[PDB]
Design a protein around this ligand. Sequence first.
Ligand code: SF4
Ligand code: SF4
Ligand code: SF4
Ligand code: SF4
Ligand SMILES: [Mg+2]
Ligand SMILES: [Zn+2]
Lengths: 97, 112, 115, 176, 144, 125, 29, 208, 96, 379
Amino acid sequence: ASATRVIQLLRNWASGRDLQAKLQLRYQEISKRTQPPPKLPVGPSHKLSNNYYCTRDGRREAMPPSIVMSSQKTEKKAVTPAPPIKRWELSKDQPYL
Amino acid sequence: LKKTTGLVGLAVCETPHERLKILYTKILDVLGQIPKNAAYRKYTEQITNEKLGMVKAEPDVKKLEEQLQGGQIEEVILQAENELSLARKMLRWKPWEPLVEEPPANQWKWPI
Amino acid sequence: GTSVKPIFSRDMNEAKRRVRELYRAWYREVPNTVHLFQLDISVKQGRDKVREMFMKNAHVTDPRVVDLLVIKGKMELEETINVWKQRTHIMRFFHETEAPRPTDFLSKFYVGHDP
Amino acid sequence: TYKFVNMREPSMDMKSVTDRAAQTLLWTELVRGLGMTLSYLFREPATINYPFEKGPLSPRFRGEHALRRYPSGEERCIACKLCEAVCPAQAITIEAEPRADGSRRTTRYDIDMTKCIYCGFCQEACPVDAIVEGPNFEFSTETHEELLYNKEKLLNNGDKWEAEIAANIQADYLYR
Amino acid sequence: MFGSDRSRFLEGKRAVEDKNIGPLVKTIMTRCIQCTRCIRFASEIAGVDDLGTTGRGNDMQVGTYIEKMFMSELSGNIIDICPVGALTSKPYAFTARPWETRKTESIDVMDAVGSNIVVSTRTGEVMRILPRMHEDINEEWISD
Amino acid sequence: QLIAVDEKLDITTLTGVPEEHIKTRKVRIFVPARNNMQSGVNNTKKWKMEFDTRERWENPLMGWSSTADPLSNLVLTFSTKEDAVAFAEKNGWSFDVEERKVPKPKSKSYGANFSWNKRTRVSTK
Amino acid sequence: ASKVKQDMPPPGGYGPIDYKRNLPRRGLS
Amino acid sequence: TRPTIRPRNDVVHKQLSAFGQYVAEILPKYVQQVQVSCFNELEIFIHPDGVIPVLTFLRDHTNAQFKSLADLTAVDVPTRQNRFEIVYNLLSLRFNSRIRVKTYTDELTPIESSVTVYKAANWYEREIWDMFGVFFANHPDLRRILTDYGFEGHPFRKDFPLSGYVELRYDDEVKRVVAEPVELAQEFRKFDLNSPWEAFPAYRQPPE
Amino acid sequence: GVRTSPTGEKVTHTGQAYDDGDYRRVRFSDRQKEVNENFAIDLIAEQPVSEVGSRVISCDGGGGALGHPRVYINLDKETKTGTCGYCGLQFRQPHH
Amino acid sequence: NLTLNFGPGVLRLVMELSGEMVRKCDPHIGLLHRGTEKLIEYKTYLQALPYFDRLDYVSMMCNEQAYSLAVEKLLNIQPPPRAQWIRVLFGEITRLLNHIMAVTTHALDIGAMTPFFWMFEEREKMFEFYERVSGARMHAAYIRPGGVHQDLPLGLLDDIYEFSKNFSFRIDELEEMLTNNRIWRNRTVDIGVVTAEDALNYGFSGVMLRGSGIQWDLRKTQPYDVYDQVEFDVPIGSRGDCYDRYLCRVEEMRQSLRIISQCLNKMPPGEIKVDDAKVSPPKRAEMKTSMESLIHHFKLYTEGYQVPPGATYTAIEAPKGEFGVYLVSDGSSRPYRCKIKAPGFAHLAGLDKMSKGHMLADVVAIIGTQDIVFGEVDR
Ligand code: SF4
Ligand code: SF4
Ligand code: SF4
Ligand code: SF4
Ligand SMILES: [Mg+2]
Ligand SMILES: [Zn+2]
């Protein structure tokens, strides 16, 4: 920014940080508003052969939900919907604030 | 002894082994009144017997917490209380009986 | 057969009793509402409107429908007690701003294609 | 992994207790906040001088609609009614009939600017780049009626903005 | 529903000149898929042998081979049977889209046959008339 | 525990529909006819219930189409005729029901085109 | 012919981004 | 299965099927059906009288303990004799799982309120009563939550018109906001987007 | 080619103009009627007819991806000139 | 014990006061009920997508992501990896916008009002990123059920990096003005305390859970896009008061910066929408040169894509908590039912419990810490 040295020192002392190191106003370091043309590569199903649609069509692979225990129609260990979650680790980067 | 278990409103339980044993014994006693053929009785008896056998064979707390796969033993006592209350409610309800009635012809038919 | 689960009333007598209690409550509340909302109507007009709205549903012969209507009326009365509505909500019952639609054949023939 | 935000136990020795008492009695943190505000006072404000300075935009900006036309001068719209069918707010009304020379052209093309949500579906469903969402945004109105655009108004908008509309389309059409 | 979603056809397409068969059926033969459905309808249902296939191979065309108007009391039905936009309704051209229109099932009264019809309207205005299936009265066709 | 009452169902007074939109409307229960421009038959499987058409006029400003009745755009889908009829009776709407029309079986033979003596001989193919 | 050109990070990636809380002590007993 | 097709997980499917069988074994009095979707989502269809028991089980059993009630909603299917379908979505944090419980009801049959089981259901239940007209018995306070005061009808039913029956404006003769029969300057254009030539043979229905 | 109504208004390119008896004309008093001066039909009628020496000619409206979908036009009929469906430009084989 | 109606985001609140304490507090909603769930049934899936931006207008791309995930699950398709990374990068950016809004609005309601401007400058910069990619500052409609609508402009990643390397100082200044302030602490500490069991039973989600000591986060337990491929920490409270939730939101802002850095560093090449022209529209050049592409573009933009019949419940970790959609499809191109679960509904339901035995001025603080936006509450 266009600030005098004395004002800069005053701001740095009052805030406690180096303001000019990380300013909040954008300057010439931003990218230009005019850019070269892009190319945008095609996807994976742009082959000229071995690309029949019946082999890569997700919608028709959907099926009606499977039915277990329809009312109209041994140890036997007890089960759970899923294994119990494992305990989280204590973030060995900054465990406490 | 640890302090501030971390969950707000959950107090630290001193001597959790005795509380767990008492709760499991009461759960088994309540389950004893359910008919034998009921699946609830056998499943809950198996679970409670496994938990009691694991809690009686480990004097430590941290190792017991790791073995129980529930963690934070106080909430394990809380779940034991919840299971006891559910067992009493279930003895009241008697859900081992056959189905109340079949649904209408196309009640669960989708689409339309 | 045709067995159904009740709501509040087992037969028509209990539903009639609940209708009577709801009517008592509305009749008692009409003057308080008129004074509090600063309506331009009189207490006689409000009581007549309550009577008309009650008699609008006089052909219902199903206890479940009757006590569901009673539940709705109780909810609306509770809405009126706590001044949750405003003057406009109360006055929407009178249609003072809508033109009076005719009834005879000739007038309906003249105005438009509406049967 | 997880962190604790409020699991710090304050020290109970004499020095820390005295420091906390001094903070309580002399308001050190209040002075620190005052100093932060004062430091923020002495830096350049972020205000721009509207309307002489305008905020930055991009070629993809959606603004007031317009109807373009071919370099020969014929309107691009062919009354395919795709934009009308894709409009989420049903803000587009189209009526068409064969022209004098048999060309497929519209007789009515209305956009209700008070119903439009400026989602850009119309300009991306168009197969001939006829309807575009222009870059103008300063088109406020004193009455409700003038916000109900018809074909003449949209064609006038296209003729008025065609320069920068075509510039933006040229700049952005490789991403579409 | 049954085809693919992309094309590997890297050559140039063909184009055939349009035919003129009267002021009822607008003809754009570049869209023809050569299913020979209109030919069969004209030969059997209408009893008129005006339509036919001239040429061989890829450049085989459907038409009359001469400047002739396909005129019959059942001429318009070839619009409905034609699966593509090769044969379309000339008075209805460029007027509406199928999803816009509302369908009302009604009865035709121009003759004593009483063929069932579907009036296709749009914003309180009749757009077109279509035949409606009834195996005992008009099958699936209506008169011009 | 069970009332076991014997009466027809009627929820007319609970739906909140205005009285002029109950005793004046005339619903239609029908299987929609196949669109003659297409050979697909997937749109003629379920029953449709729809209300009668009412007045539409041109807007004095901008020429749009205006409708004074709320039920004009309403359409309902039912699996069978009985369900739609039951719904119409329960809501207290007078209904007109039309039996579903299915194309009759037709015998088609390739051999007939090249007939020795019958008139089914094709002039060209 | 022309080569693929879209938005990608520069070779070697971007520089470190600071996110930790930085609350210093001015300093006085 | 190329990268354009969503990958399929079989372990979660097996676990959900096993737990569905386990639940249906424990409560044979109420559960009428159990289903597992192709994208690993377990749903349980039960009798209306089993709302309070089954939910309580799923909240309190040591093996289920579905503690959280994520959502509670209703679905209107007018072609059914039992018009409304009530859906409960439960999340179990201990086992990191989700379950769905489905129930049926009609206009006049009440459904026991589950405020005692889950407190979060409270407002949800009101919402249902506001939008569909399903009455919940033993509710702490059941009233409209979303519609205007005095609103007649339940908007989310399939037979309710999209634009409603009345519209609001301001009248200067009475100097207040009044309600009139609805009249639209432009009518909502209805589009027949549905097409013939069915797309999914796997869901084809018998021709009865 | 903007014409003038017998009353005095300008006629739109769609031929719309309120007649003498229409009350809606009052909406234009103390205001103006928005009319586009450039008529598409007149602007396209003055384009020269392109002369190509091929039976089938391709048109995409100019600009490639910025035009209309590419179509093919047959020029066998020597009576008239092939017209593009989208753009409206005309093509013709070199007669004589 | 007098009753008073705080009448007309915008909210109506009927409460009984016994002197200074609050006895009962009943919130009346419906003032922003427009009937989104009914209007959705009359639109195709693409036409119904923009409603979710209006749902929670402080966090828009998150709602777009939730709806897109639900439709993808119903369709049995998956987006390309680059689309998922863009979704994740944008989701993190949106989270920052939501947390800035919530914290600054809470402080302004308390009375600070300076960090509001300080951080709305950064919010304006974020709007630009939203604007550059989709042409809209707020209602973007960028994320589609096939991926994203368009690829990034060639100068977007550099600008995002330049902006995101100076945000830590903004967060530090906010903490300097708020975290250690004795007035702020007295306003927030031990206010609206909720226990873990009550928070679980009352249907709370997000910070309201994490503030009470519950270790739950949908991005960690049930990752959806590329989350299982990014490392970040989950702040956990210890008291359940407003101060703990404020600290959790600040730490979530910092972790969002961390995830943004990771996403910028690990951007893959490729396409941005699924290469299935029966679901995602083809490119304009393909549409204008290929017949199948033109047919598919026509059918997708007129009728839409048919979703196989079925019902799903898809939930994501939106900045306000668990945001879910229950979508029921009958096999057509229009959804049969779209129920929306917003955490604000349950939070405002539990407001009455959380404001027991508190002053009148404490209700404003509790409402602010609930992070309530009535668009999602009323729907
Ligand atoms: S921007 Fe969207 S709402 Fe506006 S006219 Fe275009 S499609 Fe319709
Ligand atoms: S999509 Fe384009 S060409 Fe088609 S009607 Fe709309 S503006 Fe005209
Ligand atoms: S019916 Fe149509 S597509 Fe078939 S041959 Fe005749 S013109 Fe061609
Ligand atoms: S609508 Fe059908 S006939 Fe017409 S151009 Fe498209 S594919 Fe060909
Ligand atoms: Mg045809
Ligand atoms: Zn052209």
